[PDB]
Ligand binder design. Structure first.
Ligand code: DMU
Ligand code: DMU
Ligand code: DMU
Ligand code: K
Ligand code: K
Ligand code: K
Lengths: 24, 196, 24, 196, 196, 24
């Protein structure tokens, strides 16, 4: 679906793990 | 047949399993484990503009489910990601690099849906893995159908998986069960073997 | 209980579905 | 008597049901489904001014349960709406217009309450439906008693319901189980048939 | 052996128990009941600086689990308090003054952990009660080991408890199961008799 | 562990019951 990303361009907070896992 | 003790043991085992995420396989797509939705490509959240929050009488904003509910465990009715029409995508950076061996999709059970129907459930779908960058055409790993007459949680094992590992996979929903306006995704899970 | 509504007159956020159901 | 297989099947069925909101009836008063509390009439939330939130040592505000917990599924101890005294109301716009056939009330189980007593549980209560606007005297649909020695979740079927549909109903709590200071409502559910 | 009815009854009882916080003992350390973490002494939360929240592309902040998850019921993988190294403390003001008779610790089950290992689980730990002020050297109530090969939830009964009541207790974690970098605490519960 | 309290000195909201229990 081309290069699209609507999650990235919204009023919705986005979450992502820049390092490794969180502790678990 | 069986004894009162045998029964207890069977029940203990059943509840043990029940309590291990129902199905007892790790979930590398569970958000709290370190997984995340990193793109919905061009999937348009179906916003109903219906759930108005408001303080002392003054309208603050409309709520709608983030596409990220799909990686959260609360599966009560309405806790699903809705997108416009019967086709939609979710790219998930799994919490870990794994050889994907299976996925789980689940949907609200019929008996808790009005008229015992779940037309907004996904139907035919497929899974693509990406060896690094999500913007490539990705490698297909499996194509399946969520069975609207099956159990609410259903697990799909890939046929002869390569031993190729991935950390980005995409849930690509191809059809729904007929609802004319949106598809609602409750939870998506990804199982497999961690690298070594 | 007359015309009262204390939920409406509080520090508590209130939620209501102005359209139809949310998607489910 | 029975076989090891029979047992498994019974247990699978039991857990299937268990997982369908315990009781396997849709809930038209569940908030996430599109239901909401639209009025507590003159019900005064019993604020204890006890749960202080505070950052770096500085007091921000006291927490108390919204009356809207009554339409949420988390039923751990303390997750209930409390109001002053043994009498209180909640008007709920159901997620849909239905013929109401039954309701469910539940309360924290005894074994998780101090001294195995639950005096703050509701006792005698009644249900009124409203054909449009809540400010009318509403039509009574049923009067029941929550049984403090019964099971934590209890479902009350209306006696010869009319086929009259409604979308606004009111939970009117008339007595409690003796607690001198408040009544605590955990969850209220409304079951019935959707219109056609 | 047993009858189809006997089986049903056993299963009803099992699920009844299952639904009473799994183990059917009140929890005076459950946060929603009025309990709280009042100090972690010198325990340094292990912050991974990994869970970035971000709006429209702009980095807002890193999430990490409050030490207060330890008194919350959500026990999915990752919902635990992590602290640096294999030693750490949590002081909990229980929701009530009680004679402490037992505690419960639980950890994510193996089958939902990568490689079926849980090296970040606590191992040897102890419980100190404080007769008023937490800054005293506290009175030891018990010393136990969380068994990494046992069931996920485990309850430890104190040996000949005094009838001394307390409202402040401290979970003192002494070792872990070998993870070189942090220990992760899922849930801690405190059971006992309320005063009279 | 001396008089320490890192929970008290952080970006983490802290919760405590200044009165008795909350209603339950
Ligand atoms: C103030 C901080 O804001 C937080 O934002 C978090 C992140 O968006 C949420 O955690 C949520 O994040 C989940 C997924 O990682 C889980 O770790 C947790 O259970 C939790 O529900 C949570 O609502 C909220 O306090
Ligand atoms: C930032 C947005 O704020 C939100 O407000 C919502 C509305 O008040 C909450 O959703 C809540 O609303 C419920 C009921 O509709 C459910 O849909 C959800 O599970 C959720 O807990 C939720 O705390 C919170 O993120
Ligand atoms: C706006 C108010 O902010 C609140 O802060 C509360 C306090 O920190 C949270 O309640 C939480 O507090 C718990 C523990 O007391 C429970 O009572 C509740 O279920 C709830 O999750 C809750 O996220 C949030 O709305
Ligand atoms: K979900
Ligand atoms: K509730
Ligand atoms: K927890």
């Amino acid at each position: 679906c081309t290069q699209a990303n609507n999650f990235a361009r919204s009023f919705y907070p986005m979450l992502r793990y820049t390092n490794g896992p969180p502790p678990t | 047949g069986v004894t009162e003790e045998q029964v207890h043991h069977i029940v203990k085992q059943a509840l043990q399993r029940y309590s291990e995420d129902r199905i007892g396989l790790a979930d590398y797509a569970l958000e709290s484990g370190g997984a995340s939705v990193i793109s919905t490509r061009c999937s348009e959240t179906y916003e109903t503009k219906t759930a108005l929050l408001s303080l002392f009488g003054i309208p603050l904003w409309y709520h709608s489910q983030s596409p990220r509910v799909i990686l959260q465990p609360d599966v009560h009715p309405g806790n699903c990601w809705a997108f416009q029409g019967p086709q939609g995508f979710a790219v998930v950076r799994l919490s870990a690099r794994i050889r994907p061996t299976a996925v789980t999709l689940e949907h609200v059970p019929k008996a808790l849906s009005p008229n015992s129907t779940i037309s907004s459930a996904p139907k035919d779908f497929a899974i693509f893995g990406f060896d690094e960058d999500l913007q490539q055409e990705g490698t297909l790993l499996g194509k399946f159908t969520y069975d609207q007459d099956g159990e609410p949680i259903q697990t799909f094992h890939f046929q002869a998986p390569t031993m190729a590992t991935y950390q980005v996979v995409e849930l690509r929903i191809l059809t729904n069960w007929g609802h004319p306006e949106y598809t609602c995704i409750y939870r998506f899970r990804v199982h497999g073997e961690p690298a070594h």
